[PDB]
Amino acid sequence: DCGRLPDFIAKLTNNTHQHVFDDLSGSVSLSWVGDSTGVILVLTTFQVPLVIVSFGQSKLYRSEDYGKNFKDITNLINNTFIRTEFGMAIGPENSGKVILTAEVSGGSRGGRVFRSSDFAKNFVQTDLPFHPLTQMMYSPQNSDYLLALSTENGLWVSKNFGEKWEEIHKAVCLAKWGPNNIIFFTTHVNGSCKADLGALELWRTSDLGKTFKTIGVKIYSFGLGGRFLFASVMATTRRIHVSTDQGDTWSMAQLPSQEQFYSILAANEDMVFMHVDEPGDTGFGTIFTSDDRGIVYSKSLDRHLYTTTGGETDFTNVTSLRGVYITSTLSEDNSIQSMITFDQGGRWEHLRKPENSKCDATAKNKNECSLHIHASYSISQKLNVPMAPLSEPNAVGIVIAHGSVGDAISVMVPDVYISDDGGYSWAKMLEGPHYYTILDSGGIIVAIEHSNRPINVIKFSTDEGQCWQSYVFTQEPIYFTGLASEPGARSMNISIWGFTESFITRQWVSYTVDFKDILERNCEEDDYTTWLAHSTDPGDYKDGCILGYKEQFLRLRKSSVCQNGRDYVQPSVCPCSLEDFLCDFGYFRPENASECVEQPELKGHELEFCLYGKEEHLTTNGYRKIPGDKCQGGMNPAREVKDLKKKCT
Amino acid sequence: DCGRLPDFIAKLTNNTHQHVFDDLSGSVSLSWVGDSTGVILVLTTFQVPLVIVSFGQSKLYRSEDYGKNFKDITNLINNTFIRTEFGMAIGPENSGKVILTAEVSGGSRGGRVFRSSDFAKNFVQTDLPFHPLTQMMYSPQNSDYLLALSTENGLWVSKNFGEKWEEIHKAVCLAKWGPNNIIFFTTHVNGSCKADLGALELWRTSDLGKTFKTIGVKIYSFGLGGRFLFASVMATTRRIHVSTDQGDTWSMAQLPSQFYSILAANEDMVFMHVDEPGDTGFGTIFTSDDRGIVYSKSLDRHLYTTTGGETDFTNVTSLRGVYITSTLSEDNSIQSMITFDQGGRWEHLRKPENSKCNKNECSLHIHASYSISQKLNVPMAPLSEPNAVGIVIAHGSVGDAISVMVPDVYISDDGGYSWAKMLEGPHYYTILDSGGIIVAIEHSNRPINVIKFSTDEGQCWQSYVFTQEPIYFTGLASEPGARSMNISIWGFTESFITRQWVSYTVDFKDILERNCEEDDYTTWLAHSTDPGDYKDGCILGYKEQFLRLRKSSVCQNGRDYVVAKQPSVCPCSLEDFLCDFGYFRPENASECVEQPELKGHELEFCLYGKEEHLTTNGYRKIPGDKCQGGMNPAREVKDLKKKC
Numbered sequence A: 001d002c003g004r005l006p007d008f009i010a011k012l013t014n015n016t017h018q019h020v021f022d023d024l025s026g027s028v029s030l031s032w033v034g035d036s037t038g039v040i041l042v043l044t045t046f047q048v049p050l051v052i053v054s055f056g057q058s059k060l061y062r063s064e065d066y067g068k069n070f071k072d073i074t075n076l077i078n079n080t081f082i083r084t085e086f087g088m089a090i091g092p093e094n095s096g097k098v099i100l101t102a103e104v105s106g107g108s109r110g111g112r113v114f115r116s117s118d119f120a121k122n123f124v125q126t127d128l129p130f131h132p133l134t135q136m137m138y139s140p141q142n143s144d145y146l147l148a149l150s151t152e153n154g155l156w157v158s159k160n161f162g163e164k165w166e167e168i169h170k171a172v173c174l175a176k177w178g179p180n181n182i183i184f185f186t187t188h189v190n191g192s193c194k195a196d197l198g199a200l201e202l203w204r205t206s207d208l209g210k211t212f213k214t215i216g217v218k219i220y221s222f223g224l225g226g227r228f229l230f231a232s233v234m235a236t237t238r239r240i241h242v243s244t245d246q247g248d249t250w251s252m253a254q255l256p257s258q259e260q261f262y263s264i265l266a267a268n269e270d271m272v273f274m275h276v277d278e279p280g281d282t283g284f285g286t287i288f289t290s291d292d293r294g295i296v297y298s299k300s301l302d303r304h305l306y307t308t309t310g311g312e313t314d315f316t317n318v319t320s321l322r323g324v325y326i327t328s329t330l331s332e333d334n335s336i337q338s339m340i341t342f343d344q345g346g347r348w349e350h351l352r353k354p355e356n357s358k359c360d361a362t363a364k365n366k367n368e369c370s371l372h373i374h375a376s377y378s379i380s381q382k383l384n385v386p387m388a389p390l391s392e393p394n395a396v397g398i399v400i401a402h403g404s405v406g407d408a409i410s411v412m413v414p415d416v417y418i419s420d421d422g423g424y425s426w427a428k429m430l431e432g433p434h435y436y437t438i439l440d441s442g443g444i445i446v447a448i449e450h451s452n453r454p455i456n457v458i459k460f461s462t463d464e465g466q467c468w469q470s471y472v473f474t475q476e477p478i479y480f481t482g483l484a485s486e487p488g489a490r491s492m493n494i495s496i497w498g499f500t501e502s503f504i505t506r507q508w509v510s511y512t513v514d515f516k517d518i519l520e521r522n523c524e525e526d527d528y529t530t531w532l533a534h535s536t537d538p539g540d541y542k543d544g545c546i547l548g549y550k551e552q553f554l555r556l557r558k559s560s561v562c563q564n565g566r567d568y569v570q571p572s573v574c575p576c577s578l579e580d581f582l583c584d585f586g587y588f589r590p591e592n593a594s595e596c597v598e599q600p601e602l603k604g605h606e607l608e609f610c611l612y613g614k615e616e617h618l619t620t621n622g623y624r625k626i627p628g629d630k631c632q633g634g635m636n637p638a639r640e641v642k643d644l645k646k647k648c649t
Numbered sequence B: 001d002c003g004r005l006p007d008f009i010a011k012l013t014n015n016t017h018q019h020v021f022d023d024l025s026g027s028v029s030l031s032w033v034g035d036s037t038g039v040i041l042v043l044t045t046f047q048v049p050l051v052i053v054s055f056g057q058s059k060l061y062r063s064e065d066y067g068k069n070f071k072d073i074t075n076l077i078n079n080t081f082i083r084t085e086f087g088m089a090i091g092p093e094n095s096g097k098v099i100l101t102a103e104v105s106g107g108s109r110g111g112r113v114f115r116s117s118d119f120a121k122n123f124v125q126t127d128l129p130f131h132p133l134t135q136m137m138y139s140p141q142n143s144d145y146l147l148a149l150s151t152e153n154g155l156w157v158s159k160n161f162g163e164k165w166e167e168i169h170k171a172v173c174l175a176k177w178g179p180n181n182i183i184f185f186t187t188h189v190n191g192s193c194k195a196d197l198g199a200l201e202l203w204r205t206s207d208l209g210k211t212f213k214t215i216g217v218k219i220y221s222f223g224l225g226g227r228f229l230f231a232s233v234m235a236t237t238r239r240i241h242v243s244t245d246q247g248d249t250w251s252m253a254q255l256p257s258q259f260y261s262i263l264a265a266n267e268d269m270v271f272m273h274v275d276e277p278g279d280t281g282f283g284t285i286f287t288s289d290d291r292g293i294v295y296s297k298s299l300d301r302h303l304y305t306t307t308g309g310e311t312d313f314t315n316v317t318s319l320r321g322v323y324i325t326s327t328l329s330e331d332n333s334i335q336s337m338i339t340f341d342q343g344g345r346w347e348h349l350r351k352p353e354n355s356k357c358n359k360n361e362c363s364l365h366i367h368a369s370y371s372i373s374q375k376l377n378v379p380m381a382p383l384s385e386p387n388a389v390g391i392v393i394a395h396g397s398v399g400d401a402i403s404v405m406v407p408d409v410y411i412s413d414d415g416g417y418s419w420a421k422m423l424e425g426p427h428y429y430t431i432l433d434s435g436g437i438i439v440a441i442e443h444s445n446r447p448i449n450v451i452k453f454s455t456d457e458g459q460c461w462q463s464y465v466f467t468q469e470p471i472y473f474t475g476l477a478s479e480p481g482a483r484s485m486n487i488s489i490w491g492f493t494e495s496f497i498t499r500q501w502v503s504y505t506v507d508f509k510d511i512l513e514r515n516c517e518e519d520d521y522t523t524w525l526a527h528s529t530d531p532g533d534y535k536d537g538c539i540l541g542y543k544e545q546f547l548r549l550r551k552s553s554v555c556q557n558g559r560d561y562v563v564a565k566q567p568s569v570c571p572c573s574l575e576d577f578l579c580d581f582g583y584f585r586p587e588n589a590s591e592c593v594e595q596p597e598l599k600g601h602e603l604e605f606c607l608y609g610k611e612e613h614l615t616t617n618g619y620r621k622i623p624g625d626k627c628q629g630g631m632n633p634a635r636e637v638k639d640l641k642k643k644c
């Protein structure tokens, strides 16, 4: 049971610093700039259409002492304002780069940016030779490289952190940074980008506009994931093509029985999750997985729910436990259900419902108490879930997410559920929707109620979400607007901002809380327990095996109040079992089934597919080893990919 | 100036009726059902996707004494819940028809509807043999006839007010009622409606599914407006086709020359918006003849939202021929334009009365669907009604970002010709009593307890504190009827975590105690863009005169604000004519001028398969304009004896 009253109020009251901002208009954004810099930026923005020239003044405040004091530096951005859609363009964590993209209050020949490379302590002003259509994008491999699309659909690039800009191509519809500062972009065949569905050209430049190469024609769309480049190509019908050499060579995606709607759910250096819409136009599709070449796919999960307008799904990478992914499917009776995989798409199981839930006490029927974990599918469906599932690799096994059972009331007002074993087991910890953040690599989790009333409570947990305490951080409740944490692995600082509205005018205020005094002592051996990740194959020899590697994790004991949450850790290999294999091309695991079985339609014919112009023949026991799985010994089904020395089809 | 003296708080306190609702979950909707019936329904709904089966219980409360008392009748809809997207399917006014379309808690073979034809005083339940994909639709000619699309894209029709249903066609994408119980609908050949865009077939049935007729192929979309049927056809580019004979014959829209949208259409005329070639967020409004075929330039640089295509186009239903929308000025300022002759001529909206004005823009922008789609803080579009002649209430902003972020509420009493800022900040508002009562409620994050009301058509406002426990505002609903005096406010308190819902019904009967006398009215004429005295009071060639309650009036009006007069027609002038095909009116200009690119070549268009030649002075009479005499410009459509 939880430890009642380790007194925190005194240690938090003296570490809570309020700042009132007078006469702020528009939306107010707050952000920490850097780890251990002390810098917090507060900026007001305005919702103004791009084409409209209007007058306005954004306000800008800066703290250099961790939120205790703010200096008005609006004079730096005199006679400009920033649109809410743009906000701040903050570079990578250790770069110190911040860019404010603004519009001149009276109008001008182009936009105006304010550039800082010292954690927002000094800005320089630069007039753009164009009006930005969207926010400027940093190159992932070089924060000095910026690209921006103009309102004239021109592609502009800067090599020196936005100081000097050059237009490298006109009539561009979409542009994206690839790897090693490559730029991919689409261009017109004629008039409008909207009217030219399926007739765009995909272009590549590897030297920031000096030379170009057309890598695709008749393009519907394109995207990037992991080491893979994807393009939807119009033949009257759409097919998916994959490239792992930045478009020099393409191969059509090979799916058993490339369709009208596709989506890359996730992709890394090892594999691809691909969603393909079911024939006709229903609310569900199918998840396919590929090898590290991104070409040959196999059926992974049926009836995967997606929003027909936008393609969002509940697909969630559980980043706090290797190999774990969660998403939502439509059961046979059209109930929503959360499925979870612990082997990177090889096998999926129903998410387990909490034991002895309040739902179990009132449910007049089973399956009513199934737990649906809310993500982008719920959010796009306009449900009241203010945050997707939250996890981070440093906080091993911790997942925080909104969830609902099979009641309309629960769907309307989700609750916050906590998992400490990467999603295998869940407990309802907070009533109603919340905003939440992880600090101190999981040593501190904080949540704030999301409702119509003004709030004055911080809820926090120091034992990975098992026990919660409430801290009244003000006597004047605020309509909550934002929650922002200082970055860093050992973070203790968090800022809340919002406003009072006793009459018609909003008075904005920020509260910065330092949790330094709460976690005084360092955890010892009796403060932890040990746990092994869940395995779907039975046997003590298979407990704790993740993709062929057995490992052991710690977990803070319930009611713990201590720091030094050691990094959860000698590697050992497991024997091979079914959980270490995906189904092969043409095979699948029926719902609730452990073994792969050949899809019925292919039972008659030989399994063949196209691989870079060469037709291949597949003989298989129905299995192929999961990319990245270091399994050895045990079960080893056989497969052979024989080249037929023939052109495709 | 306003008369603050008549103390109203005593006359309103005894006429304010509170009802507290226990354990309401989900979204809460409230609606009056019928003129002088006394019926108010309160229903809880849930935001749940269509395909998902879940458990839930909607709650249903009914008042039969004008909101003083509510009876829990949830048992009527036991074991069902209603989706927020569906709500209630309310038949036409005075029909008495209400239908609650629900799904069964836990799933079933089809939906379940609860049907009433006596203003929701008695319901009967019917199990549907299908799951409805969208809300059921009443036939405008017969409220017993219903239409519904199933989640399997089957087309279902009922002839007996939803008691018995028949499936008349499968694989249907969209279906709509025509004028005489005709049904137009599109169907694909195989697969998906999304994938078969531009390859759909447009079908018609005039006998509720007994027989069908294919009236269009290669269809992208279709729609109905006024007496016009529209279809978008995929050729290499998409173009719009019009039919005035229910699809037996079509004609392509003839524009002097891209994406096409129908802004509005009635029995006389079509408003068409045409997107610029490069998609820069603005387009051009074109107007048609009475056939919907021949179009001419009406308004340039018409702003539209780049994704949904919404514009600020607003029909001022309280004054004939008046429309307002937003355009992009030469320096990319937003501006409101107004027409008093149904698109013939547009003028800049006049600056608000009594204002202190720097920049070039103290101009007043009236907020509508373009502002709403641009995510501005505008909770309601402009509000007007035909019975409340000349009254328009709308959100407006001047040309500073602060004003755009927090618009104010403006009042016009002459159909939008002149405007005054009457309320600070965004509000919800409603008109009842044919304009005798206007009510407004603040839109903000804090709970409210004040009702703002006007009894002189918006010229003077008073504040009434209707409760000591402020509520987070949810809705404002007025009793229907020309002489209505009751409104309902509902919302919830949330002192802790739980919402407690409550309704407040206010009766203005004691406020408007005495009846207005002759000294309570003034008379006015609608604005005319031609300055002659022979055109005073002329609206589209027809003379009329209006009344208006004097400022600070607190009395009940029983007269139609249109004075009863023998009808008289006006002489023709420029305001009575559109520009002809190939002509347009420059900004602020009264006379039409030929578009420059066409000044050299012969004006030609295709009309019913035959190529036609147009010689014109630049004008054509506005469709519906009852003008006679006066100006008579010449035009001739000469057949060229050629196919097209």
Ligand SMILES: *[C@@H]1O[C@H](CO)[C@@H](O[C@@H]2O[C@H](CO)[C@@H](O[C@@H]3O[C@H](CO)[C@@H](O)[C@H](O)[C@@H]3O)[C@H](O)[C@H]2NC(C)=O)[C@H](O)[C@H]1NC(C)=O
Binding pocket: A266, A267, A268, A269, A271, A273, A317, A318, A319, A320, A321, A322, A323, A393
């Ligand atoms: C789902 O989220 C997890 C966690 O973020 C992703 O896993 C991580 O992916 C990165 C890059 O692929 C891995 O980095 C690698 O780092 C190691 C060690 O420095 C290096 O030897 C490799 O060459 C590689 O650069 C990282 O280790 C890995 N972390 C874990 C816990 O697996 C995963 O990629 C996501 N899934 C998908 C499909 O994207």
Ligand SMILES: *[C@@H]1O[C@H](CO)[C@@H](O[C@@H]2O[C@H](CO)[C@@H](O[C@@H]3O[C@H](CO)[C@@H](O)[C@H](O)[C@@H]3O)[C@H](O)[C@H]2NC(C)=O)[C@H](O)[C@H]1NC(C)=O
Binding pocket: A036, A065, A066, A488, A490, A491, A492, A493, A514, A516
């Ligand atoms: C969380 O926020 C707190 C502030 O509320 C941070 O603590 C502050 O850190 C600064 C910089 O390390 C400390 O300043 C230093 O003082 C020494 C002399 O003692 C001086 O040489 C340095 O130049 C600097 O001024 C400051 O004292 C300290 N304030 C408090 C109240 O502890 C803290 O670093 C933040 N991060 C974490 C992880 O807690």
Ligand SMILES: *[C@@H]1O[C@H](CO)[C@@H](O[C@@H]2O[C@H](CO)[C@@H](O[C@@H]3O[C@H](CO)[C@@H](O)[C@H](O)[C@@H]3O)[C@H](O)[C@H]2NC(C)=O)[C@H](O)[C@H]1NC(C)=O
Binding pocket: A332, A333, A367, A590, A591, A592
């Ligand atoms: C995987 O396992 C689950 C059980 O854990 C299987 O679920 C079952 O699904 C059927 C529907 O396919 C449920 O059935 C019946 O539905 C009818 C409606 O037509 C209803 O009238 C009956 O009362 C009944 O509920 C059944 O209840 C359910 N079983 C359980 C224990 O929940 C699922 O089908 C399996 N998947 C595969 C591919 O085999």
Ligand SMILES: *[C@@H]1O[C@H](CO)[C@@H](O[C@@H]2O[C@H](CO)[C@@H](O[C@@H]3O[C@H](CO)[C@@H](O)[C@H](O)[C@@H]3O)[C@H](O)[C@H]2NC(C)=O)[C@H](O)[C@H]1NC(C)=O
Binding pocket: B036, B065, B066, B479, B481, B483, B484, B485, B486, B507, B509
């Ligand atoms: C606004 O709401 C009030 C109630 O707050 C409505 O007043 C009520 O209307 C009915 C019908 O006129 C009245 O009831 C009965 O009328 C019959 C005559 O058919 C009579 O014999 C009964 O004795 C009874 O009065 C009811 O008394 C009346 N007023 C009140 C205060 O209860 C009113 O009709 C609503 N609408 C308008 C436009 O004011």
Ligand SMILES: *[C@@H]1O[C@H](CO)[C@@H](O[C@@H]2O[C@H](CO)[C@@H](O)[C@H](O)[C@H]2NC(C)=O)[C@H](O)[C@H]1NC(C)=O
Binding pocket: B264, B265, B266, B267, B315, B316, B317, B318, B319, B320, B321, B386
């Ligand atoms: C714009 O609003 C007005 C007011 O509703 C419409 O005018 C009426 O049209 C109906 C149906 O044709 C007639 O029955 C009424 O007699 C008209 N009333 C008035 C005051 O004109 C008008 O048709 C609407 N739509 C368009 C496209 O203008």
Ligand SMILES: *[C@@H]1O[C@H](CO)[C@@H](O)[C@H](O)[C@H]1NC(C)=O
Binding pocket: A075, A078, A079
């Ligand atoms: C910029 O702001 C200053 C206030 O410091 C103001 O006086 C000045 O007019 C502005 N400059 C321009 C060019 O508008």
Ligand SMILES: *[C@@H]1O[C@H](CO)[C@@H](O)[C@H](O)[C@H]1NC(C)=O
Binding pocket: B075, B078, B079
């Ligand atoms: C509501 O419906 C359920 C299922 O039909 C039934 O068991 C229950 O008795 C009903 N409640 C009432 C009050 O009739």
Ligand SMILES: *[C@@H]1O[C@H](CO)[C@@H](O)[C@H](O)[C@H]1NC(C)=O
Binding pocket: B348, B587, B588
């Ligand atoms: C058009 O008329 C308005 C109102 O009289 C005037 O203010 C404006 O300057 C005119 N516009 C142009 C472009 O001349």
Ligand code: NA
Binding pocket: A092, A140, A141, A142, A143, A144
């Ligand atoms: Na870098």
Ligand code: NA
Binding pocket: A133, A134, A135, A136, A137, A147, A148, A149, A150
């Ligand atoms: Na951009």
Ligand code: NA
Binding pocket: B035, B036, B037, B479, B481, B484, B485
């Ligand atoms: Na009445």
Ligand code: NA
Binding pocket: B102, B103, B104, B105, B107, B108, B109, B110, B111, B112
């Ligand atoms: Na049902």
Ligand code: NA
Binding pocket: B177, B178, B179, B180, B181, B182, B183
């Ligand atoms: Na009809």
